[PDB]
Design a protein around this ligand. Sequence first.
Ligand SMILES: [Cl-]
Ligand SMILES: [Ho]
Ligand SMILES: [Ho]
Lengths: 129, 133
Amino acid sequence: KGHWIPVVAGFLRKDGKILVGQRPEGQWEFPGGKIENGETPEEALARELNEELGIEAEVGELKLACTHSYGDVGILILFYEILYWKGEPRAKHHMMLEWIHPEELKHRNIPEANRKILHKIYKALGLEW
Amino acid sequence: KGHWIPVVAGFLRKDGKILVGQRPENNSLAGQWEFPGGKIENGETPEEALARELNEELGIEAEVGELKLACTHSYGDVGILILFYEILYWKGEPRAKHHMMLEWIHPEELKHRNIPEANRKILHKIYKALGLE
Ligand SMILES: [Cl-]
Ligand SMILES: [Ho]
Ligand SMILES: [Ho]
């Protein structure tokens, strides 16, 4: 077997908080989405943040990559830091957007793929857990 | 959409130089120089894939350090996603188990080497991740 879906996700950081979106009916995920053939990962992410949030984001440092399996398919998530953007994030894809202290992730319903690597996420934000 | 193939590659350094390997004689990229690494297998993390690949290609036991860069290649309807990791620490000295030949080069000389067409197009990003230019 050998099937894979590459995904980009943004860590939008502001005032010590991180932006998280509630999946449509709800788990809380980092905004972003799938990489389309022909796009760089940074292009994909700028596009998805524009599509989901309506912002024009500067894609910053590549922080982390993780793999997870959904049985028949492999998922590869690339996590990029976003420190600068134009526009305000609006919930045009998610039922709810929320700024949270990274600490809250420990007690929010996030995808099990994100929960299993939460230690890596905090390290990737330069935080201790 | 098409299909995606995730790939890992490692930056190993020697007194400023960087390790490249020349693809073997009946290879799809026979004669061309690349960073060591290979495909991620199902179930494994990119770091697990890279440590395995480095042992199988170089005969070394390496620790996988910081993720430095991710790049995409398109070959028609197939996409390649390459993750480049810094490799600071390993046991042993790389030997040509897979490649025709190994060489430690000055990273700035990468552009003058016979490198894969796809690798050339991402060279500016590789320089930036290596701390050059
Ligand atoms: Cl997510
Ligand atoms: Ho999207
Ligand atoms: Ho390999």
